[PDB]
Amino acid sequence: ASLIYRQLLTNSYSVDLYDEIEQIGSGKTQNVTINPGPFAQTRYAPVNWDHGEINDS
Amino acid sequence: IKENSYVYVDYWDDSKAFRNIVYVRSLAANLNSVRCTGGSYHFSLPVG
């Protein structure tokens, strides 16, 4: 019964087929690789509030 | 219209630069000053 190990080693190539099968079976996702470089947050502006355009006559 | 008065001109365009004016941090510009002159008007008067 020693030939079990010999047979498994010799026939091990079929695991490539098994890998292809499980690859086809598995669902897939992916990445949108993130950007670095938010090193400078930006404020709005120097903003001053005032009454609008008065309509004089 | 006098020194007291202002005059407004609304303007717009379908170019990229103007279409991108939705949010603004600062908008500066310099213009050429121009002269506005007034023509003549006959007051249509049914006598005199």
**Which residue is closest to A46 within chain B, CA to CA?**
B25
Q: Name residues whose C-beta falls within 8 Å of residue B4's C-beta, 6 or more positions apart in sequence.
A: A56
Q: How many residues does chain B have?
A: 48
Residue B29: which of B37, B19, B17 has the closest Cα?
B17
- Please give the method by which this entry was determined: cryo-EM
CA pair distance A16, A22, nearest whole angstrom: 10
CB proximity list for B27: less than 8 A, separation 6 or greater: B21
Resolution (A): 3.5
Terminal Cα-to-Cα distance of chain A (whole angstroms) = 111
A45 in contact with B, Cβ within 8 Å: yes
B3-6 LR contacts (CB < 8 Å, sep 24+):
B4/A56
On chain B, the residues whose CB falls within 8 A of the CB of A44 are: 25
